[PDB]
Design a protein around this ligand. Structure first.
Ligand SMILES: *[C@@H]1O[C@H](CO)[C@@H](O[C@@H]2O[C@H](CO)[C@@H](O)[C@H](O)[C@H]2NC(C)=O)[C@H](O)[C@H]1NC(C)=O
Ligand SMILES: *[C@@H]1O[C@H](CO)[C@@H](O[C@@H]2O[C@H](CO)[C@@H](O)[C@H](O)[C@H]2NC(C)=O)[C@H](O)[C@H]1NC(C)=O
Ligand SMILES: CC(=O)N[C@@H]1[C@@H](O)[C@H](O)[C@@H](CO)O[C@H]1O
Ligand SMILES: *[C@@H]1O[C@H](CO)[C@@H](O)[C@H](O)[C@H]1NC(C)=O
Ligand SMILES: [O-][O-]
Ligand SMILES: [Cu+2]
Ligand SMILES: [Cu+2]
Ligand SMILES: [Cu+2]
Length: 549
């Protein structure tokens, strides 16, 4: 009686996709505008004048077709659909410098992809810091669920926020050893703001419950530099999926959610009819936010007082310091799959933060190098011009996975007391290990029996007082030819160099590749760069360094 009739929660979505014959077609203008999301006016870049951008909605098995037209004047654009597998469809992944040139003002790009997973994610620009000026929106793919509920509330975005744009902050961030500071936050694009005169402008997010009913909230952390704990005073939360992977449901009183990650939760309306605070609390070990305790929304029961703030108390779950994921034991995919890593290629990418040049600028290095690649010469252009290319520069940050279905096991490690959300394109990886301190190849234990599986996980780090450092280990099979970004999801870090490209099954790129799709946009882009100085990529060390993204 569903659009995926004949399939269900135990279907292996990596191997089988419902045939729906339906195409969901969107049209996205990327616009240069202003908004007062917490009652203070500021410039924003948005999809169709909205924040968050409109939700892309589809059923499992549909095809989605998104026309993106750049209506801005001084940025290119490219849209990435986060967590979408893009199996044999790498050129639709929307990564400038990898899969395409950026789309210039007054040009378009049509993304087409298959909904070959179900649950919750998001699309966002993958061009420089653009996603965090506002170019992002939900993806909501209907499908089976590991628990029942009554109403689907759709996306719930969590964002940090300042009244200066991230682009305005960037030069300061490049030149500083300290992490960036933000003034406030938004819950699905809303908050109040308290002015210097103690006026309240703006409006808080608010949602309304009927007593007894069960609600699905699809949380997404779209922040630039904040790891949050999300909670609802007095209400427990049943987690039912992490990223695009349904899991064995479990109940908790808060959700720790890093950048790029999603969790689906079911909240039952089982408390006294009242107003309760919804809280999105930046974790202070890796977030610096002036208003940690005032990024709140309002859960309003029918039967509660109207026009009246909650007086509920926060769940006493501990402190709001460390930046942590749910544990490996907590996240058990419903579809059980083992990490078959015998014969895997082993790699390690170290993470460091290093000064460069005379200023200096502080860049993040992954695998030994700050990524330094070219918007106008994308990796797929390089491999089209030279199919057997082997001369990768250190600055291209390459990791090869040349053999079909061979596993890679990648350890991402740091000595620094700084945790990072790692995102891999083109794949759900198997999260084998996450931990603190030094990585111990003799001692570490790798979880291979139905490990958590998802597309974004933290490289956790110890605090300075505990010696700093940490690591995560993922595995994935080479099941998807393409050039796939793996990088830190913090927009400032990635732009500063924290990224590597997986060159997967290079001899099979002609399986998906289209020179016309690449060159049309590349020619448009060069035409724009000839007339507009924002068309040239700044890659030197005395201005706003762009890794290529
Ligand atoms: C959005 O529009 C503003 C203009 O309102 C652009 O900013 C201006 O950029 C020009 C460069 O063409 C500067 O000479 C002006 O000083 C800028 N004005 C302000 C208010 O800073 C901005 O570049 C646009 N952004 C995009 C992405 O197109
Ligand atoms: C990032 O890479 C580019 C190479 O594409 C570097 O720029 C070149 O550097 C040489 C010598 O340093 C210059 O003389 C060339 O004119 C530069 N070419 C371009 C295209 O700008 C750049 O220095 C690198 N940046 C970092 C931080 O290493
Ligand atoms: C200012 C400018 O050059 N406008 C062009 C227009 O000529 C063209 O019709 C349209 C679609 O290709 O793209 C834009
Ligand atoms: C948040 O915003 C999206 C996009 O506008 C919307 O579809 C969704 O309903 C919102 N979520 C809630 C819970 O209001
Ligand atoms: O996806 O970043
Ligand atoms: Cu993303
Ligand atoms: Cu980072
Ligand atoms: Cu990415």
């Amino acid at each position: 009686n569903t659009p995926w009739q004949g399939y269900d929660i135990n279907t292996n979505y990596y191997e089988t996709i419902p045939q729906t014959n339906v195409v969901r077609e969107y049209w996205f203008d990327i616009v240069n505008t202003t908004a007062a999301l917490d009652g203070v006016e500021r410039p924003v870049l948005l999809v169709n004048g909205q924040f968050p951008g409109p939700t892309i909605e589809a059923n499992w098995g549909d095809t989605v077709k998104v026309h993106v037209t750049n209506r801005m004047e001084n940025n290119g654009t490219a849209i990435h659909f986060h967590g979408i597998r893009q199996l044999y469809n790498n050129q639709m992944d929307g990564v400038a410098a990898l899969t395409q040139c950026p789309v210039p003002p007054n040009s378009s790009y049509t993304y087409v992809w298959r909904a070959e997973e179900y649950g919750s994610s998001w699309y966002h620009s993958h061009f420089s810091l653009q996603a965090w000026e506002g170019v992002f929106g939900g993806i909501l793919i209907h499908g089976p669920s590991t628990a029942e509920y009554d109403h689907d509330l759709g996306m719930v975005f969590l964002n940090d926020w300042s009244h200066q744009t991230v682009d305005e902050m960037y030069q300061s961030v490049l030149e500083s050893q300290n992490p960036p500071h933000f003034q406030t936050g938004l819950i699905n694009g809303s908050n109040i703001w308290v002015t210097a005169d103690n006026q309240t402008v703006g409006r808080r997010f608010q949602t309304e419950f009927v007593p007894g009913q069960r609600y699905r909230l699809r949380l997404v952390n779209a922040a630039m530099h904040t790891h949050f704990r999300f909670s609802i005073d007095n209400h427990d939360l049943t987690v039912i999926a992490s990223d695009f992977v349904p899991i064995v449901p479990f109940t908790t009183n808060n959700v720790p959610i890093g950048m790029g990650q999603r969790y689906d939760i079911i909240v039952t309306a089982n408390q006294a009819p009242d107003n309760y605070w919804i809280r999105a609390i930046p974790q202070s070990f890796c977030s610096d936010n002036a208003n940690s305790d005032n990024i709140k929304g309002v859960l309003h029961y029918e039967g509660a007082a109207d026009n009246s703030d909650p007086t509920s108390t926060k769940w006493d779950y501990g402190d709001d310091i460390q930046c942590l994921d749910f544990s490996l034991d907590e996240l058990v995919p419903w579809l059980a799959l083992d990490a078959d890593i015998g014969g895997a290629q082993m790699a390690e990418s170290d993470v460091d933060f290093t000064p460069f040049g005379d200023v200096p600028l502080y860049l993040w290095t992954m695998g030994g190098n700050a990524l330094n690649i070219s918007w106008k010469d994308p990796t797929l252009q390089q491999t089209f011009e030279d199919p057997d290319k082997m001369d990768w520069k250190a600055s291209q940050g390459v990791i090869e996975a040349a053999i079909p279905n061979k596993w890679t096991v990648l350890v991402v490690q740091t000595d620094l007391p700084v945790p990072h959300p790692i995102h891999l394109h083109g794949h759900d990886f198997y999260l084998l290990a996450q931990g603190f301190g030094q990585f111990n190849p003799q001692n570490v234990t790798l979880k291979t029996h139905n490990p958590p599986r998802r597309d974004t996980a933290l490289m956790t780090a110890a605090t300075p007082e505990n010696g700093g450092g940490g690591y995560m280990v993922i595995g994935f099979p080479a099941d998807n030819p393409g050039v796939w970004l793996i990088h830190c999801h913090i927009g400032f870090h990635a732009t500063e160099g924290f990224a590597q490209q997986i060159v997967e099954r290079q001899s099979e790129f002609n399986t998906f590749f289209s020179e016309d799709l690449l060159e049309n946009t590349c020619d448009a882009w060069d035409e724009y760069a000839k007339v507009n100085p924002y068309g040239h990529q700044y890659r030197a060390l005395a201005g706003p360094y762009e890794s290529g993204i």
